[PDB]
Design a protein around this motif. Structure first.
Motif, PDB file in Angstrom:
ATOM      1  N   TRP A 179       0.806  -1.226   0.000  1.00  0.00           N
ATOM      2  CA  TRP A 179       0.000   0.000   0.000  1.00  0.00           C
ATOM      3  C   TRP A 179       0.836   1.273   0.000  1.00  0.00           C
ATOM      4  O   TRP A 179       0.317   2.370  -0.173  1.00  0.00           O
ATOM      5  N   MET A 239      -5.818  -5.954   3.204  1.00  0.00           N
ATOM      6  CA  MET A 239      -6.679  -4.830   3.601  1.00  0.00           C
ATOM      7  C   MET A 239      -8.157  -5.005   3.166  1.00  0.00           C
ATOM      8  O   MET A 239      -9.063  -4.738   3.945  1.00  0.00           O
ATOM      9  N   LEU A 240      -8.382  -5.481   1.946  1.00  0.00           N
ATOM     10  CA  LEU A 240      -9.735  -5.707   1.424  1.00  0.00           C
ATOM     11  C   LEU A 240      -9.881  -7.162   0.923  1.00  0.00           C
ATOM     12  O   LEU A 240      -9.679  -7.440  -0.256  1.00  0.00           O
ATOM     13  N   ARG A 296     -11.858  -3.882  13.665  1.00  0.00           N
ATOM     14  CA  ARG A 296     -10.665  -3.073  13.464  1.00  0.00           C
ATOM     15  C   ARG A 296     -10.555  -1.853  14.379  1.00  0.00           C
ATOM     16  O   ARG A 296      -9.598  -1.107  14.261  1.00  0.00           O
ATOM     17  N   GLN A 355     -13.339  11.260   4.795  1.00  0.00           N
ATOM     18  CA  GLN A 355     -13.614  11.763   6.157  1.00  0.00           C
ATOM     19  C   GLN A 355     -14.226  13.151   5.974  1.00  0.00           C
ATOM     20  O   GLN A 355     -13.931  13.828   4.971  1.00  0.00           O
ATOM     21  N   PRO A 368     -11.926  13.235  13.992  1.00  0.00           N
ATOM     22  CA  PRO A 368     -11.842  12.143  13.038  1.00  0.00           C
ATOM     23  C   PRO A 368     -13.261  11.646  12.706  1.00  0.00           C
ATOM     24  O   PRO A 368     -14.001  11.219  13.586  1.00  0.00           O
ATOM     25  N   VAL A 380     -15.193   9.410   9.852  1.00  0.00           N
ATOM     26  CA  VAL A 380     -15.215   8.552   8.675  1.00  0.00           C
ATOM     27  C   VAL A 380     -16.551   8.676   7.955  1.00  0.00           C
ATOM     28  O   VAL A 380     -17.592   8.458   8.557  1.00  0.00           O
ATOM     29  N   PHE A 424     -19.594   8.964  10.719  1.00  0.00           N
ATOM     30  CA  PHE A 424     -19.469   8.841  12.169  1.00  0.00           C
ATOM     31  C   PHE A 424     -18.136   9.373  12.650  1.00  0.00           C
ATOM     32  O   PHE A 424     -17.177   9.447  11.893  1.00  0.00           O
ATOM     33  N   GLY A 448     -15.429   9.970  16.359  1.00  0.00           N
ATOM     34  CA  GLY A 448     -15.103   9.755  17.776  1.00  0.00           C
ATOM     35  C   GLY A 448     -14.080  10.811  18.173  1.00  0.00           C
ATOM     36  O   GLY A 448     -14.315  12.017  18.023  1.00  0.00           O
ATOM     37  N   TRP A 449     -12.946  10.364  18.684  1.00  0.00           N
ATOM     38  CA  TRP A 449     -11.776  11.248  18.890  1.00  0.00           C
ATOM     39  C   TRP A 449     -10.501  10.464  18.606  1.00  0.00           C
ATOM     40  O   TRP A 449     -10.516   9.232  18.614  1.00  0.00           O
ATOM     41  N   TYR A 450      -9.402  11.178  18.388  1.00  0.00           N
ATOM     42  CA  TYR A 450      -8.184  10.553  17.873  1.00  0.00           C
ATOM     43  C   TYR A 450      -7.435   9.752  18.918  1.00  0.00           C
ATOM     44  O   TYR A 450      -7.436  10.077  20.109  1.00  0.00           O
ATOM     45  N   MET A 451      -6.783   8.696  18.455  1.00  0.00           N
ATOM     46  CA  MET A 451      -5.664   8.131  19.207  1.00  0.00           C
ATOM     47  C   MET A 451      -4.453   8.827  18.590  1.00  0.00           C
ATOM     48  O   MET A 451      -4.390   8.927  17.385  1.00  0.00           O
ATOM     49  N   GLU A 467      -2.525   7.810  15.126  1.00  0.00           N
ATOM     50  CA  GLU A 467      -3.157   7.953  13.814  1.00  0.00           C
ATOM     51  C   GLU A 467      -2.596   9.174  13.077  1.00  0.00           C
ATOM     52  O   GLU A 467      -2.328   9.109  11.871  1.00  0.00           O
ATOM     53  N   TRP A 478      -4.789  -4.530  12.825  1.00  0.00           N
ATOM     54  CA  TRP A 478      -5.272  -3.167  12.972  1.00  0.00           C
ATOM     55  C   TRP A 478      -5.289  -2.637  14.401  1.00  0.00           C
ATOM     56  O   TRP A 478      -5.123  -1.443  14.599  1.00  0.00           O
ATOM     57  N   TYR A 530     -16.835  -1.592   3.890  1.00  0.00           N
ATOM     58  CA  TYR A 530     -16.327  -0.745   2.817  1.00  0.00           C
ATOM     59  C   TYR A 530     -17.254  -0.808   1.620  1.00  0.00           C
ATOM     60  O   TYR A 530     -17.991  -1.769   1.443  1.00  0.00           O
TER      61      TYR A 530
HETATM   62  N1  LIG Z   1     -10.025   7.879  16.202  1.00  0.00           N
HETATM   63  C1  LIG Z   1     -10.859   7.502  15.220  1.00  0.00           C
HETATM   64  C2  LIG Z   1     -12.247   7.587  15.390  1.00  0.00           C
HETATM   65  C3  LIG Z   1     -13.061   7.202  14.318  1.00  0.00           C
HETATM   66  C4  LIG Z   1     -12.460   6.740  13.135  1.00  0.00           C
HETATM   67  C5  LIG Z   1     -11.073   6.681  13.003  1.00  0.00           C
HETATM   68  C6  LIG Z   1     -10.390   6.238  11.702  1.00  0.00           C
HETATM   69  C7  LIG Z   1     -10.051   7.488  10.864  1.00  0.00           C
HETATM   70  C8  LIG Z   1      -9.055   8.445  11.524  1.00  0.00           C
HETATM   71  N2  LIG Z   1      -7.755   7.987  11.021  1.00  0.00           N
HETATM   72  C9  LIG Z   1      -7.860   7.189   9.801  1.00  0.00           C
HETATM   73  C10 LIG Z   1      -9.378   7.124   9.548  1.00  0.00           C
HETATM   74  O1  LIG Z   1      -9.812   5.810   9.227  1.00  0.00           O
HETATM   75  C11 LIG Z   1     -10.507   5.715   7.991  1.00  0.00           C
HETATM   76  C12 LIG Z   1      -9.519   5.178   6.966  1.00  0.00           C
HETATM   77  N3  LIG Z   1      -9.120   3.826   7.310  1.00  0.00           N
HETATM   78  C13 LIG Z   1      -8.369   3.040   6.329  1.00  0.00           C
HETATM   79  C14 LIG Z   1      -9.202   2.933   5.058  1.00  0.00           C
HETATM   80  C15 LIG Z   1      -8.588   1.990   4.054  1.00  0.00           C
HETATM   81  C16 LIG Z   1      -7.806   2.449   2.985  1.00  0.00           C
HETATM   82  C17 LIG Z   1      -7.267   1.531   2.073  1.00  0.00           C
HETATM   83  C18 LIG Z   1      -7.528   0.164   2.235  1.00  0.00           C
HETATM   84  C19 LIG Z   1      -8.325  -0.275   3.308  1.00  0.00           C
HETATM   85  F1  LIG Z   1      -8.601  -1.579   3.513  1.00  0.00           F
HETATM   86  C20 LIG Z   1      -8.849   0.637   4.209  1.00  0.00           C
HETATM   87  N4  LIG Z   1     -10.306   7.064  14.056  1.00  0.00           N
END
Ligand SMILES: Nc1cccc(C[C@H]2CNC[C@H]2OCCNCCc2cccc(F)c2)n1
Ligand code: HEM
Ligand code: HEM
Ligand SMILES: Nc1cccc(C[C@H]2CNC[C@H]2OCCNCCc2cccc(F)c2)n1
Ligand SMILES: C[C@H](O)[C@H](O)[C@H]1CNc2nc(N)[nH]c(=O)c2N1
Ligand SMILES: C[C@H](O)[C@H](O)[C@H]1CNc2nc(N)[nH]c(=O)c2N1
Ligand SMILES: [Zn+2]
Lengths: 411, 407
Positions: free
Chosen positions: A8, B38-39, B105, B169, B256, B258, B275, B277-280, B283, B369, B397
């Motif tokens: 990736w 990933m997918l 995840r 996002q 953050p 999504v 949706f 939340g808040w960050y770790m 990220e 993850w 997805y």
């Molecule tokens: N702290 C939080 C709270 C809610 C949600 C989140 C994930 C967000 C923020 N930081 C990244 C983003 O997550 C969404 C993107 N995630 C990866 C998408 C992806 C891309 C390519 C292939 C594949 F399989 C998946 N964090």
């Protein structure tokens, strides 16, 4: 059939056909992935196909598939199996076999090296003293005064499962652990049970923080016997830091030779229950896991104290800070003493080149991401971003039960 | 059929039975593990509806009551008549909370039952979607005291009238290619940034330009909207020890959120369900800032720390990595914007796993993850075996809309 993996970070996409030659099961199904689970006497009947598959692989690798030599060897093995219930590998097949078990080891990041393995044939060994002698020679050869060379020593295969050769140590060189009456541990807490067995067997324990354990060796199903590796054969590195002069006063050291001795080597259906092997360290094995796991030496606090980091909240990242410093210390110390070591950047980068070459030349490279990704700084190594396919090929290294759990004591 | 997971640090063994409820496929087989990939009609809908309603009525201790059997017949009549059905508000909220609860995840699931659900099923236009989204952004941000939220737009019908947020996002930064060959801003968003441009957005062409929303209602062409900047809480990134850190010109956003996933509840499909939340901290500090294909800032930071960059074994990357992450957490904390460090979040997830095992019989978790992208083994999750499997309700997805949309 074809399966694709994507990096990736680079968009490089690879195609796996090698997975088609896998028959052994993973632990996973269509409904559950067991990818993070650590741990997910053959009949003549089951033996001949295993031998046939292996010899077909061996003869193909030497470009003699279907030759008269190939056919004659199949027939000879067939006859030997029906007559004796087992068979013996030729030296050439043993060497090929051992190298391929390493090549196929999906949890090993160091496999770029797989074709450079010194194989010591110890199948003529009969006693524990004989094993001790073979193992000393392996340790001296592999150590090479700090210029480490990969090596494996292969003891006689399993016959009826009542006459097994086993090295009871999990690694040839490891430090003792001692549980104190007050519940604290001196030395390496991973080795407490094994240290306790050694003591019972008669080892006189120095009771310090880095006591090299004795070998506990079992030949031909007999009760195991203790031996002390000559100290002059055990290369150790005192750990210091290039900028922090107090780091030496932690009193840390580690041994140079990582040497797994508790796995089972399977080649053509034959089982080699004592096959100690060794390479050289990747720094994180010591600096991250041996030193900083909570259940191991657990030095993070003491290091962070000495660095004067803010320790009252996890969000200062004191632990991450001390972690990097300890790992710098490990690499610096080994390099300064000219003892072979590889850092996790170099090792993972080499693994990606290896994996790509394997896809191109072999049609695949089974890899277990959970184990390949280093235990610090994961996503700043290229393996984190690499999709991997995990499957089981033979020849193989397998886990086997701890021998104190299964041994029939003779007295 | 009953499965054990072990923690190797603590020896705690938990027994998983929840996996037996799982229905959808993992991608793995007996012969091959795909853990790191990933997918990897009315006839179909009634079983899905039934499975869901059964778990809903069980959760309120009314399984097999007259109320339960009444609802199943009423839904069944509705599917028989309309080919779809409508969730009660109670069902929708339960469904949304459980999709989060089931997200294998997500490390932040200890929070799963405190989710504010905004029902936007009455929405008809992109202006309306924009309104709902601003309201979600302001509610969730709460002046830096972040609250978890989801906004749920109308469900899929015949699939040519999909609601979608085109953004991955709600809040992200634009990416621009130049003659340079280099990328300015976020390389992840180059294609989307260019789609915005072609649709009419005039871009500042800077390093940290908050992207516009591109909103699709009822399968229509999507429209642009700028989120009121006073609604976008951003944090300037500084270091508690390194005064020069501020001059790298780094900032990140607080929320953050999504917006490209599909929420499935009782067989119904919600293609637009942003949706947040808040960050770790990792990220942003590890992934957003240090991925080679993202802001890729390790080189510049190491240079300002005056480290030896000649050899990998000095661990200059690893030193700089830690410092960048210290700065992220310090900056958010100083500006009073909710954030969690990877140590705290992973310690919380272990406690959450224990609650789930004891109260639900398991917790689906994707180790690949869940383990943070730095300092893996010094967090407890590294040593925790996890079983990964798919439960519904779920977040899934879906294809990027630009590849799919019929203009
Ligand atoms: N702290 C939080 C709270 C809610 C949600 C989140 C994930 C967000 C923020 N930081 C990244 C983003 O997550 C969404 C993107 N995630 C990866 C998408 C992806 C891309 C390519 C292939 C594949 F399989 C998946 N964090
Ligand atoms: C040459 C340098 C080598 C390096 C740097 C290296 C690196 C590693 C590392 C870091 C691991 C994971 C260890 C752990 O976390 O417990 C590993 C696992 C393993 N390696 Fe290597 N390796 C090397 C050589 C070898 C050799 C010579 C063999 C056998 C011929 C081998 C076979 C294996 C096997 C079977 C595992 C799995 C061990 C287990 O599951 O406990 N490796 N390797
Ligand atoms: C409350 C604080 C939260 C924290 C700290 C958190 C943490 C995270 C992290 C670190 C990831 C991985 C992101 C990535 O690496 O790309 C993630 C993924 C995810 N989370 Fe959360 N989360 C939180 C709230 C939520 C909420 C409110 C929901 C939905 C209601 C949610 C559902 C998901 C889903 C579906 C994924 C997978 C996303 C993907 O595959 O791209 N999480 N979570
Ligand atoms: N660099 C090298 C070269 C050769 C070999 C090695 C692995 C060694 C060194 N550092 C760790 C040790 O690896 C052997 C121990 N590995 C864990 C065994 C284990 C425990 C519990 C469950 C389970 F499934 C497996 N590194
Ligand atoms: C539970 C989990 O699978 C376990 O802790 C694994 C994770 N990855 C690992 N990776 C390596 N190289 N060595 C290990 O001991 C482990 N432990
Ligand atoms: C190939 C691999 O699966 C991929 O890089 C994954 C690894 N683990 C991850 N973990 C999280 N939380 N987020 C990610 O994007 C990824 N990427
Ligand atoms: Zn799997």
């Amino acid at each position: 059939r074809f399966l694709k993996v994507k990096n990736w970070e680079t968009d490089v996409v690879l195609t796996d056909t090698l997975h088609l030659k896998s028959t052994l099961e993973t632990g996973c199904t269509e409904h559950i992935c067991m990818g993070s689970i650590m741990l997910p006497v053959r009949t003549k009947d089951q033996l001949f196909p295993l031998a046939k598959e292996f010899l077909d692989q061996y003869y193909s690798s030497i470009k003699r598939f279907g030759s008269k030599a190939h056919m004659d060897r199949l027939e000879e093995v067939n006859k030997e199996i029906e007559s004796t219930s087992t068979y013996q590998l030729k030296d050439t097949e043993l060497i090929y076999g051992a190298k391929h078990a390493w090549r196929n080891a999906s949890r090993c990041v160091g496999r770029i090296q797989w074709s450079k393995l010194q194989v010591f044939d110890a199948r003529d060994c009969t006693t524990a003293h004989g094993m001790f002698n073979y193992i000393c020679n392996h340790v001296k050869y592999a150590t090479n005064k700090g210029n480490l060379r990969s090596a494996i020593t292969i003891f006689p295969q399993r016959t009826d499962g009542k006459h097994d050769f086993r090295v009871w140590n999990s690694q040839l060189i490891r430090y003792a652990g001692y549980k104190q009456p007050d519940g604290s541990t001196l030395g390496d807490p991973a080795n407490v049970q094994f240290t306790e067995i050694c003591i019972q067997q008669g080892w006189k324990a120095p009771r310090g923080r880095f006591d090299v354990l004795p070998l506990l060796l079992q030949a031909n199903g007999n009760d195991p016997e203790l031996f002390q590796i000559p100290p002059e054969l055990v290369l150790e590195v005192p750990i210091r830091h290039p900028k922090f002069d107090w780091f030496k006063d932690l009193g840390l050291k580690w041994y140079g030779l990582p040497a797994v001795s508790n796995m089972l080597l399977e080649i053509g259906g034959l089982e080699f229950s004592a096959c100690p092997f060794s390479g050289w360290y990747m720094g994180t094995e010591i600096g991250v896991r041996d030193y900083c796991d909570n259940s191991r030496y657990n030095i993070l606090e003491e290091v962070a104290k000495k660095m004067d980091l803010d320790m009252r909240k996890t969000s200062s990242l004191w632990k991450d800070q001390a972690l990097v410093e300890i790992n710098i210390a490990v690499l610096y110390s080994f390099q300064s003493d000219k003892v072979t070591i590889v850092d996790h950047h170099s090792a993972t980068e080499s693994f990606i080149k290896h994996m790509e070459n394997e896809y191109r030349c072999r049609g695949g490279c089974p890899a277990d991401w959970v184990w390949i990704v280093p235990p610090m700084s994961g996503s700043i190594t290229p393996v984190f971003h690499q999709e991997m396919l995990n499957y089981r090929l033979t020849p193989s290294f397998e886990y086997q039960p701890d021998p104190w759990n299964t041994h029939v004591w003779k007295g």
